[PDB]
Amino acid sequence: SLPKWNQPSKEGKKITNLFVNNSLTHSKVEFIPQEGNKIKWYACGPTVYDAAHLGHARTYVSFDIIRRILVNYFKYDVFMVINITDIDDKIIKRSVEEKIGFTELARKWEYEFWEDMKSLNVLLPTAITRVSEYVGDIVKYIEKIIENKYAYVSEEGSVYFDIDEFKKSEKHFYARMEPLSVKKKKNAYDFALWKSSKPNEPHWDSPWGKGRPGWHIECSTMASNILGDVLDIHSGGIDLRFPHHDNELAQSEAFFDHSQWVNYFLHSGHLHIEGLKMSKSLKNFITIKNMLTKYTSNQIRILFLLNKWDNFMNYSPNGESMVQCIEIDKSFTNFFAIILMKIKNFDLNSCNLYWSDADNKLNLLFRQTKNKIHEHFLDNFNTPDALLAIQKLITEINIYMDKEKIQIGLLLEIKHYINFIFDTFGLIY
Amino acid sequence: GSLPKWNQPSKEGKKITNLFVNNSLTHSKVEFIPQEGNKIKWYACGPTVYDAAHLGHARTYVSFDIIRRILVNYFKYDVFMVINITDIDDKIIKRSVEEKIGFTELARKWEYEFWEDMKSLNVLLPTAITRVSEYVGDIVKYIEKIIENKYAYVSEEGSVYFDIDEFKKSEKHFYARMEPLSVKKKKNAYDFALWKSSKPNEPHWDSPWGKGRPGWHIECSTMASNILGDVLDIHSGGIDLRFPHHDNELAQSEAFFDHSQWVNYFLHSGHLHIEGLKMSKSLKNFITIKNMLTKYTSNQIRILFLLNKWDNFMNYSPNGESMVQCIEIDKSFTNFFAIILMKIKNFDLNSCNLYWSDADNKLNLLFRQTKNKIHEHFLDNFNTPDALLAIQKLITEINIYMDKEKIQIGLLLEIKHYINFIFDTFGLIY
């Protein structure tokens, strides 16, 4: 009556003791790769019919930070896939309103999305998978689900996922992550895998007639084709947990006829503005480009570093939430300014390098800070507390650089470590 | 009895990578295990600063810079490193009377040029730099303790000598742990000075035993013990220092703390040879780092050292013969970055197709396999020659892919970032 989860075996794997908040268990559980030190990761992409806003940035920046922690800090090997839904009801509707082709519209806003990601120092994924380029593969995927008896064909030529038949199987559970969120259909909760197309919509040939993919099938198809029958990580915003992500799990389980397509499902919290999700529908949004005419990439990334990735956050506009981000960014800028100059202008010919008690105390705080940051990252990517640890260390380095005769080698090593953590955060100074 | 024993640190609570290193204390490759957490306390012997450093010195400091970058940048150990500067020495005293400038002025000049040469080679400075001239008082206190533990004696002239026989008698101490077979005022000829009575006209310092100078080995035990403590994870230097210098440091430090294992892993770089012999100031067969750098770049010199396993000797053929391959490799890396950066710059998302093709998948398969190959090479006693080869082979296939196949922009960027990561670990700059 309740979905079960299988933790991957630890034998032969990279073991860091990292714990992550897994939506499949609704708990923090130890992260263990399926193979070695490898992480196969699929992340749902944007719907490219319009500009991206600060809420989209929160999700992609937060998972960029997580990816950099996993790769740059823990040295996992991440193979990441993000889809682009360039065919969708919204794209069709917008393209008729504006009197341009569906592809021209989608390519424009896909281009602007990646430009915005690059402006925010977000790394591109290994693979970018457009629906328009995967329709043939989607048809083949749907054929297999039908052959496994988990989908049926309507008279009009649509294909629907058969929830009742899927649930019946002892190896399958429907809606593993939100169990309680559950005429021609057998049951109302069945969802389309293939939609019969109106003659005026864009459409593709199939064994069942001209149509389009349903809302969820492209993600199962693309990830299964490139990454296979087990994903280490699947991610997205919390609104996608159901129906979209739970439906992907059912589709992929139905295709492979197994019980666990994803080991760790990670959901970022929403950015709210004035108490409500930042939303195109609510017209309360700030585009990323507008945000970048007021604040820098570092400042926006600090905003997201200050908020735990899997919790919702409130954005107060008119600069209110950004005051703290600007202060922190300024302290990082001024810290680097001083330490870089002290290093550059240090003179080995005239200095004294005796390792003093003041040098030893700063070094002790330095090594301790490294251990604290390590524990924060293992604690479900706790960047707010890691950022605070860096701030505390900087306060003490600033005192040391002002008064004590300086240990050039220690300052260089401290500069390199803080650069390493800032690279991990995606900050550029 | 009759053979030195070695205690491997316990694994509980430590960072465990399965790295193996060639340990001179065991004369074997053994698993590297920190004394504490992920921390590595590391002392490396510094240069004698009375004249210019040469390519043999560069080989040792660059090879251990590469190892330090592997430990820190690649494996994420926390390295705390100390290097001494011997700015008081017989050679410095004699050279300063020849040059007719003060010993301090001469020593500071050639220390400064040593660090400039290191920076020119992209060698990272250590955490602490310990000059003998700033540590004499601490050295005196260290010797006082060795005398108090009955492991040293004072001669009538005011010198202090290490008492090898008394040290060996202790069941917890073995003398010459690393080269056991290499072993009038003295009790026995093998005793060595901790404090030397001052000769007339020499620089000198006060002590309870009279005016004098440190012996040849005592500063390193003193400085490392003061900053790093009673157990070092790593101690390093060239193979010529293994005995008497490093074995004598072990004896001094064991005598000070009256314990049995001051160093867990002793690493010795091989010598750079020229025409079959060690590159040597005495043999006048040396090439200064500065002269090398007027003909070759930092990258090219670092590639020369990456191509030779750190703990084996290497032959350097002059007149550009050994550098031919280094220049070719460096050029292939420069050209790779030029090409991949242009392909990235000119990629057009509006006109591309991004279907993940079989060609894309084959390159990705090679990419991830290369990552695991390099990982095993680094775990295998820092095997940079084979890691460098793996990177070269990967670049050969990336160049083919960029020329013909429709390119996966994200995959090319990810491969570039990984190669940047390994090159940072090597100390190469492109």
Ligand SMILES: Nc1ncnc2c1ncn2[C@@H]1O[C@H](COS(=O)(=O)NC(=O)[C@@H](N)CCC(=O)O)[C@@H](O)[C@H]1O
């Ligand atoms: N206010 C907010 N705060 C924080 N995250 C927010 C957000 N609004 C959207 N998101 C998250 O941003 C990502 C992109 O959202 S989006 O452009 O609307 N696209 C979509 O929702 C769908 N295209 C995802 C499904 C798929 O196509 O596979 C998705 O992960 C989405 O959950």
Ligand SMILES: Nc1ncnc2c1ncn2[C@@H]1O[C@H](COS(=O)(=O)NC(=O)[C@@H](N)CCC(=O)O)[C@@H](O)[C@H]1O
């Ligand atoms: N041809 C060669 N090939 C490869 N390594 C070579 C080398 N010649 C010297 N080395 C190594 O370079 C390092 C510095 O050497 S050096 O400047 O002569 N100084 C000394 O030997 C002493 N000052 C070390 C003892 C001490 O002072 O603590 C030492 O580690 C030494 O072993």
Ligand code: NA
């Ligand atoms: Na079931």
Ligand code: NA
């Ligand atoms: Na939902």
Ligand code: NA
């Ligand atoms: Na003994």
Ligand code: NA
């Ligand atoms: Na020797």
Ligand SMILES: [Zn+2]
């Ligand atoms: Zn999706």
Ligand SMILES: [Zn+2]
């Ligand atoms: Zn030494």
